[PDB]
CSV table of C-alpha atoms and ligand atoms in Angstrom, one decimal:
chain,number,residue,atom,x,y,z
A,33,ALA,CA,0.0,0.1,-0.2
A,34,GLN,CA,1.7,3.7,-0.9
A,35,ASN,CA,1.8,6.3,1.9
A,36,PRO,CA,0.9,4.0,4.3
A,37,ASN,CA,1.3,6.7,7.4
A,38,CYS,CA,-1.2,9.0,5.1
A,39,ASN,CA,1.8,12.0,4.5
A,40,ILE,CA,1.0,14.9,2.6
A,41,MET,CA,2.6,14.3,-0.4
A,42,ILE,CA,4.1,17.5,-2.9
A,43,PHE,CA,3.7,17.0,-7.1
A,44,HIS,CA,6.2,18.8,-8.9
A,45,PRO,CA,4.9,18.1,-12.4
A,46,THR,CA,6.1,19.3,-15.5
A,47,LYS,CA,4.8,21.3,-18.0
A,48,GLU,CA,3.8,17.7,-19.8
A,49,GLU,CA,2.2,16.2,-17.0
A,50,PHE,CA,0.1,19.5,-16.5
A,51,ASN,CA,-2.0,18.6,-19.2
A,52,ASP,CA,-4.2,16.1,-18.4
A,53,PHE,CA,-5.9,17.3,-14.9
A,54,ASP,CA,-7.5,13.9,-14.7
A,55,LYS,CA,-4.8,11.9,-15.4
A,56,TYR,CA,-2.7,13.6,-13.2
A,57,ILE,CA,-4.7,13.2,-10.4
A,58,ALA,CA,-5.0,9.6,-10.4
A,59,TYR,CA,-1.7,9.6,-11.5
A,60,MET,CA,-1.0,11.4,-7.7
A,61,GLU,CA,-3.6,8.6,-6.1
A,62,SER,CA,-1.5,5.8,-7.6
A,63,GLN,CA,1.4,7.3,-5.4
A,64,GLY,CA,-0.9,7.0,-2.0
A,65,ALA,CA,-1.7,11.1,-1.7
A,66,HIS,CA,-5.3,10.6,-1.2
A,67,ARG,CA,-4.5,8.9,2.0
A,68,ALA,CA,-3.1,12.1,3.4
A,69,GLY,CA,-6.6,14.0,2.9
A,70,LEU,CA,-4.4,16.8,1.0
A,71,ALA,CA,-1.6,17.1,-1.2
A,72,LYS,CA,0.5,20.0,-2.7
A,73,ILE,CA,1.2,20.5,-6.1
A,74,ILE,CA,3.8,22.3,-7.1
A,75,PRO,CA,2.4,24.3,-10.9
A,76,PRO,CA,5.8,23.9,-13.2
A,77,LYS,CA,8.1,26.6,-13.9
A,78,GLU,CA,6.6,27.8,-16.9
A,79,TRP,CA,2.7,27.6,-15.8
A,80,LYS,CA,1.4,31.5,-14.8
A,81,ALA,CA,-2.8,31.4,-14.0
A,82,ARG,CA,-2.5,35.0,-15.2
A,83,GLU,CA,-0.5,37.9,-16.4
A,84,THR,CA,-0.8,40.5,-13.5
A,85,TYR,CA,-2.4,41.0,-10.2
A,86,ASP,CA,-2.3,44.7,-10.7
A,87,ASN,CA,-5.5,45.7,-12.1
A,88,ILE,CA,-8.2,43.0,-8.6
A,89,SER,CA,-9.0,46.0,-6.5
A,90,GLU,CA,-12.5,46.9,-8.0
A,91,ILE,CA,-14.1,42.9,-7.0
A,92,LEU,CA,-16.7,43.6,-4.7
A,93,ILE,CA,-17.0,41.7,-1.5
A,94,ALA,CA,-20.7,41.9,-1.6
A,95,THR,CA,-21.1,39.9,2.2
A,96,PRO,CA,-17.5,40.2,4.1
A,97,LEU,CA,-17.9,37.9,7.5
A,98,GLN,CA,-16.7,38.8,10.8
A,99,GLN,CA,-15.5,35.9,12.1
A,100,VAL,CA,-16.2,35.7,15.8
A,101,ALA,CA,-14.8,33.5,18.4
A,102,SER,CA,-16.3,31.9,21.6
A,103,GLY,CA,-14.6,29.0,23.7
A,104,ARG,CA,-11.1,28.3,24.4
A,105,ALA,CA,-8.4,29.1,22.4
A,106,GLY,CA,-7.7,25.4,21.5
A,107,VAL,CA,-11.6,24.9,20.8
A,108,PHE,CA,-13.7,27.0,20.1
A,109,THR,CA,-16.7,27.7,17.4
A,110,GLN,CA,-17.4,30.5,15.2
A,111,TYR,CA,-19.8,32.8,13.8
A,112,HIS,CA,-20.2,34.6,10.7
A,113,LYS,CA,-21.7,38.2,11.4
A,114,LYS,CA,-22.1,40.1,8.0
A,115,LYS,CA,-20.6,43.0,7.7
A,116,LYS,CA,-21.4,45.8,5.1
A,117,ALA,CA,-20.0,45.8,1.3
A,118,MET,CA,-16.3,46.5,0.2
A,119,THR,CA,-14.2,46.3,-2.7
A,120,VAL,CA,-11.3,44.3,-2.4
A,121,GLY,CA,-9.1,47.6,-2.8
A,122,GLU,CA,-10.7,48.2,0.7
A,123,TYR,CA,-10.6,44.5,2.5
A,124,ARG,CA,-7.0,44.9,1.0
A,125,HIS,CA,-6.3,48.1,2.9
A,126,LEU,CA,-8.3,46.7,5.5
A,127,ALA,CA,-6.2,43.5,6.1
A,128,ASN,CA,-3.1,45.8,6.3
A,129,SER,CA,-4.1,47.4,9.2
A,130,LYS,CA,-3.0,48.3,12.8
A,131,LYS,CA,-6.1,46.6,13.9
A,132,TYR,CA,-5.6,43.7,11.4
A,133,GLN,CA,-2.9,42.9,10.3
A,134,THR,CA,-0.4,39.9,10.5
A,135,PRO,CA,2.1,40.6,14.0
A,136,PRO,CA,6.3,40.9,13.6
A,137,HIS,CA,7.1,36.6,13.6
A,138,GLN,CA,10.2,34.8,13.2
A,139,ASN,CA,8.7,32.2,10.9
A,140,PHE,CA,5.4,29.5,9.9
A,141,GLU,CA,5.9,28.1,13.2
A,142,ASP,CA,5.9,31.4,15.1
A,143,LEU,CA,2.9,32.6,13.5
A,144,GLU,CA,1.5,28.6,14.2
A,145,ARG,CA,2.3,29.6,18.0
A,146,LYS,CA,0.3,33.6,18.3
A,147,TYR,CA,-2.9,32.2,15.9
A,148,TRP,CA,-3.9,29.2,18.5
A,149,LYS,CA,-2.9,31.3,20.9
A,150,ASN,CA,-4.4,34.7,20.2
A,151,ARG,CA,-7.4,34.0,17.7
A,152,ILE,CA,-10.0,33.6,19.4
A,153,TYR,CA,-9.4,37.0,21.0
A,154,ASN,CA,-9.7,39.1,17.7
A,155,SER,CA,-12.9,38.9,14.9
A,156,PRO,CA,-10.9,39.0,11.5
A,157,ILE,CA,-13.1,39.6,8.4
A,158,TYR,CA,-13.1,37.0,5.6
A,159,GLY,CA,-14.3,37.4,2.0
A,160,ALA,CA,-15.1,34.1,1.7
A,161,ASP,CA,-17.4,32.3,-1.1
A,162,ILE,CA,-17.6,34.8,-4.0
A,163,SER,CA,-18.3,33.3,-7.3
A,164,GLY,CA,-16.2,34.2,-9.4
A,165,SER,CA,-12.3,33.5,-11.6
A,166,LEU,CA,-8.9,34.7,-11.3
A,167,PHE,CA,-8.1,32.4,-13.9
A,168,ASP,CA,-6.9,34.0,-17.2
A,169,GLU,CA,-9.2,32.1,-20.5
A,170,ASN,CA,-6.8,31.3,-21.9
A,171,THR,CA,-5.1,29.7,-19.3
A,172,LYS,CA,-5.1,25.8,-21.0
A,173,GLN,CA,-3.9,24.0,-17.5
A,174,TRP,CA,-5.3,24.0,-14.4
A,175,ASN,CA,-7.8,26.3,-14.8
A,176,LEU,CA,-10.4,26.0,-11.8
A,177,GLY,CA,-12.5,27.7,-14.4
A,178,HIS,CA,-12.9,24.4,-16.9
A,179,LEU,CA,-12.5,21.8,-15.5
A,180,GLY,CA,-14.7,18.7,-15.8
A,181,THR,CA,-17.7,19.1,-13.9
A,182,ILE,CA,-19.0,17.4,-11.2
A,183,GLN,CA,-22.4,16.8,-13.1
A,184,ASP,CA,-20.6,15.2,-16.4
A,185,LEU,CA,-18.8,12.7,-13.7
A,186,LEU,CA,-21.7,11.4,-12.2
A,187,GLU,CA,-23.2,11.0,-15.9
A,188,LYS,CA,-20.1,9.3,-17.1
A,189,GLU,CA,-19.7,6.6,-14.2
A,190,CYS,CA,-23.5,6.1,-13.6
A,191,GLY,CA,-25.8,7.3,-16.5
A,192,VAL,CA,-27.9,9.5,-14.8
A,193,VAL,CA,-27.9,13.1,-16.6
A,194,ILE,CA,-29.0,15.8,-14.4
A,195,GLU,CA,-29.2,19.6,-13.4
A,196,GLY,CA,-26.7,21.7,-11.7
A,197,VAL,CA,-23.6,23.7,-12.4
A,198,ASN,CA,-20.4,23.9,-10.4
A,199,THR,CA,-18.1,27.6,-11.0
A,200,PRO,CA,-15.1,28.3,-8.7
A,201,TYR,CA,-14.9,30.5,-5.9
A,202,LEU,CA,-13.2,33.3,-4.4
A,203,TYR,CA,-11.3,34.0,-0.6
A,204,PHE,CA,-10.4,37.0,-0.3
A,205,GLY,CA,-8.3,36.1,3.5
A,206,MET,CA,-6.3,38.1,6.3
A,207,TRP,CA,-4.2,37.5,9.4
A,208,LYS,CA,-6.8,35.3,11.4
A,209,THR,CA,-9.3,34.2,9.3
A,210,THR,CA,-10.1,31.0,9.9
A,211,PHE,CA,-11.8,28.2,7.9
A,212,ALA,CA,-13.5,25.5,10.4
A,213,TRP,CA,-12.6,21.3,10.4
A,214,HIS,CA,-15.3,20.3,7.6
A,215,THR,CA,-15.1,17.5,4.8
A,216,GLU,CA,-17.0,18.9,1.7
A,217,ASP,CA,-20.2,18.8,0.7
A,218,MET,CA,-21.0,15.5,-0.3
A,219,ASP,CA,-17.7,14.4,0.6
A,220,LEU,CA,-16.3,15.9,-3.0
A,221,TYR,CA,-12.7,16.6,-3.9
A,222,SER,CA,-11.4,20.4,-3.4
A,223,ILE,CA,-9.1,21.9,-5.6
A,224,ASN,CA,-7.4,25.1,-4.2
A,225,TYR,CA,-5.5,27.8,-5.6
A,226,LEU,CA,-3.4,30.3,-3.6
A,227,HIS,CA,-3.3,33.3,-6.8
A,228,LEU,CA,-1.3,35.4,-4.4
A,229,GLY,CA,-0.2,37.4,-1.1
A,230,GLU,CA,0.6,35.6,2.1
A,231,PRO,CA,0.1,31.7,3.1
A,232,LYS,CA,-2.3,29.7,4.2
A,233,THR,CA,-1.7,27.1,6.7
A,234,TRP,CA,-4.0,23.3,6.7
A,235,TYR,CA,-4.4,20.6,9.2
A,236,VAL,CA,-5.8,17.0,7.8
A,237,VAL,CA,-6.9,14.2,8.5
A,238,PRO,CA,-6.5,11.1,6.4
A,239,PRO,CA,-9.6,10.1,5.2
A,240,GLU,CA,-9.4,6.5,7.1
A,241,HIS,CA,-9.8,7.8,9.9
A,242,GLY,CA,-12.0,11.1,10.0
A,243,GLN,CA,-14.4,8.9,12.0
A,244,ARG,CA,-12.3,9.6,15.2
A,245,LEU,CA,-12.5,13.2,14.3
A,246,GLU,CA,-16.2,13.4,14.4
A,247,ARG,CA,-15.9,11.9,18.2
A,248,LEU,CA,-13.5,13.8,19.2
A,249,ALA,CA,-15.8,16.5,18.2
A,250,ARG,CA,-19.0,15.2,19.2
A,251,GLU,CA,-17.0,15.1,22.8
A,252,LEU,CA,-16.0,18.8,22.9
A,253,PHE,CA,-19.0,20.1,21.6
A,254,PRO,CA,-22.3,18.4,23.2
A,255,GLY,CA,-25.1,20.3,22.6
A,256,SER,CA,-23.8,21.2,18.7
A,257,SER,CA,-23.7,17.4,18.4
A,258,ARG,CA,-27.2,16.5,20.3
A,259,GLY,CA,-28.5,19.5,18.0
A,260,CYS,CA,-27.3,17.7,14.4
A,261,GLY,CA,-26.0,13.9,13.6
A,262,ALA,CA,-23.2,15.5,11.2
A,263,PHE,CA,-22.8,19.4,12.3
A,264,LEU,CA,-19.2,19.3,11.3
A,265,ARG,CA,-20.9,20.3,7.6
A,266,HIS,CA,-22.4,23.5,9.5
A,267,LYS,CA,-18.6,24.4,9.3
A,268,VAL,CA,-18.2,26.5,12.6
A,269,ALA,CA,-15.7,24.2,14.6
A,270,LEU,CA,-12.2,24.7,15.8
A,271,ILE,CA,-10.0,22.1,17.3
A,272,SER,CA,-6.3,23.0,17.7
A,273,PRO,CA,-3.2,20.4,16.9
A,274,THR,CA,-2.4,20.3,20.9
A,275,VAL,CA,-5.9,19.6,21.3
A,276,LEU,CA,-5.8,17.2,18.5
A,277,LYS,CA,-2.4,15.7,19.6
A,278,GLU,CA,-3.8,15.2,23.3
A,279,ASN,CA,-6.4,12.9,21.8
A,280,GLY,CA,-4.1,11.1,19.9
A,281,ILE,CA,-6.7,12.1,16.5
A,282,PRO,CA,-3.9,11.3,13.7
A,283,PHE,CA,-3.5,14.7,11.2
A,284,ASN,CA,-0.5,16.0,9.4
A,285,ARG,CA,0.0,20.0,8.6
A,286,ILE,CA,1.5,21.9,5.6
A,287,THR,CA,1.4,25.4,4.6
A,288,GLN,CA,0.3,26.6,1.4
A,289,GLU,CA,2.2,29.7,-0.6
A,290,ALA,CA,1.2,31.5,-3.5
A,291,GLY,CA,1.6,30.2,-6.6
A,292,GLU,CA,0.4,26.6,-5.1
A,293,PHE,CA,-2.9,24.0,-5.4
A,294,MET,CA,-3.8,22.2,-2.8
A,295,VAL,CA,-6.0,18.8,-3.1
A,296,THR,CA,-8.0,18.0,-0.6
A,297,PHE,CA,-9.9,14.1,-1.1
A,298,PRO,CA,-12.7,12.8,-0.6
A,299,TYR,CA,-14.0,12.3,3.1
A,300,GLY,CA,-10.6,14.8,4.3
A,301,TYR,CA,-11.4,16.7,6.8
A,302,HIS,CA,-9.6,19.8,7.1
A,303,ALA,CA,-9.2,23.0,8.7
A,304,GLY,CA,-6.9,26.1,8.8
A,305,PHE,CA,-5.8,29.9,9.0
A,306,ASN,CA,-4.8,32.9,6.4
A,307,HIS,CA,-1.4,34.3,7.5
A,308,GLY,CA,-1.8,37.5,6.7
A,309,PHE,CA,-3.9,39.4,3.0
A,310,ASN,CA,-4.4,36.5,0.3
A,311,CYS,CA,-6.7,35.5,-2.2
A,312,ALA,CA,-7.7,31.7,-3.2
A,313,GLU,CA,-9.4,30.6,-5.6
A,314,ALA,CA,-11.7,27.2,-4.7
A,315,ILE,CA,-13.3,25.0,-6.4
A,316,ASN,CA,-14.9,20.9,-5.9
A,317,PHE,CA,-14.5,18.5,-8.6
A,318,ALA,CA,-15.4,14.2,-8.8
A,319,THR,CA,-13.3,11.2,-10.0
A,320,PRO,CA,-14.6,7.7,-9.9
A,321,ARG,CA,-13.0,7.3,-6.8
A,322,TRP,CA,-15.5,9.5,-5.6
A,323,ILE,CA,-18.5,8.4,-5.9
A,324,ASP,CA,-18.7,5.4,-3.5
A,325,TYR,CA,-18.0,8.6,-0.8
A,326,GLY,CA,-20.6,10.6,-1.8
A,327,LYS,CA,-22.5,7.7,-1.6
A,328,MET,CA,-22.2,7.3,2.2
A,329,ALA,CA,-21.3,10.9,3.1
A,330,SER,CA,-23.5,12.3,6.7
A,331,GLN,CA,-25.7,15.3,6.2
A,332,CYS,CA,-27.2,18.0,7.8
A,333,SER,CA,-30.8,17.6,8.6
A,334,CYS,CA,-31.1,20.1,10.9
A,335,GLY,CA,-31.1,23.2,8.6
A,336,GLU,CA,-28.4,24.9,9.6
A,337,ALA,CA,-25.7,23.8,6.9
A,338,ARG,CA,-28.0,24.8,3.5
A,339,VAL,CA,-25.8,24.6,0.7
A,340,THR,CA,-26.2,25.3,-3.1
A,341,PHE,CA,-28.1,24.0,-5.4
A,342,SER,CA,-26.3,21.3,-7.2
A,343,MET,CA,-26.3,19.4,-4.1
A,344,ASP,CA,-29.9,18.5,-4.4
A,345,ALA,CA,-29.7,15.7,-7.7
A,346,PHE,CA,-26.6,14.3,-5.6
A,347,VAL,CA,-28.3,14.2,-2.8
A,348,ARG,CA,-31.4,12.3,-5.0
A,349,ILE,CA,-29.6,10.3,-7.0
A,350,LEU,CA,-26.5,9.1,-4.5
A,351,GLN,CA,-29.0,8.8,-1.2
A,352,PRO,CA,-32.5,8.8,-2.2
A,353,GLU,CA,-33.5,7.0,1.2
A,354,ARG,CA,-31.9,10.6,2.8
A,355,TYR,CA,-33.5,12.6,0.6
A,356,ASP,CA,-36.8,13.2,1.6
A,357,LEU,CA,-35.4,14.4,5.1
A,358,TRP,CA,-32.7,16.2,3.7
A,359,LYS,CA,-34.7,17.9,1.4
A,360,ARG,CA,-37.2,19.2,4.9
A,361,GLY,CA,-33.6,20.5,6.4
A,362,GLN,CA,-33.0,22.5,2.8
A,363,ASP,CA,-36.7,24.2,3.0
B,1,LIG,O1,-9.3,28.4,1.8
B,1,LIG,C1,-10.9,28.6,2.6
B,1,LIG,O2,-11.1,29.5,3.2
B,1,LIG,C2,-11.1,27.1,2.8
B,1,LIG,N1,-10.9,26.0,1.7
B,1,LIG,C3,-11.5,25.0,1.3
B,1,LIG,O3,-12.0,24.4,2.3
B,1,LIG,C4,-11.0,24.5,-0.1
B,1,LIG,O4,-10.6,24.4,-0.5
B,1,LIG,O5,-11.5,23.3,-0.1
B,2,LIG,MG1,-11.3,45.2,-10.3
B,3,LIG,NI1,-12.7,22.7,2.1
B,4,LIG,ZN1,-27.5,20.6,10.9
């Protein structure tokens, strides 16, 4: 078995290997990359996502989210307070202000220490989940707006034609902006490209051990667990590496820098934080190997997780028993 300790693997495809996206994902899995839940892909040196980032300041962040924490430093939830609209140029200036800017630090490890010590005492503002793309239309390789769609994959594998669309999302971050522990909708893959700015640190639990993280989360968030049998779908809970180590949960960590891709694999729980002002683009995707994970994915039916239009068909076709209850949650 390849990669039996479930380490995060880093790949350096050549420009020739960067042509065929599906083939390269299947290659990475042949080497065991999926066992970690997360992989890094460094693009060939010839490749670029677009020519420059000099003209992005007028993108609108219609609903910036202030991430307010509750709990203790290593075990907390966050809620998202909606703020007034602002442009990316306005948000960049805010991220760089004395109130929000990255503190002085020695290296990524010192910054990580500072994040876990101090995150809860601040409420950073995240421009998350903005439909759109920063890939030039002429970028032919690993263009996250030109991937094969999940609906087309389901149709190719299973023969059923379904409604729905699959488009990318932009994320504008600042110091301490946080992504809570989650797997993707329907335990899909994700791919995330860091277009510009400061790094993003990731934590990940191997898919084969995801239920260990879930059992810890039920212990640590006991009211949330009684409220919903899949409350991590709410994407609000944080657990630090120190707490994971104290409870024996297998995980790994890695820092993504500008110009790098990350792939999350089906049922790979992940969480993390931004180091400073940045912009990432991400989208979900599927392969043949995903289908079985989609059939088994948990679902939130309490009403909190409220998701996209396109998830309807995935539930309806892959999980017809759960369909009725899940749809009641969505309505
Ligand atoms: O970058 C972020 O805030 C969160 N991204 C992801 O969870 C992802 O790409 O799957
Ligand atoms: Mg602009
Ligand atoms: Ni994710
Ligand atoms: Zn729920």
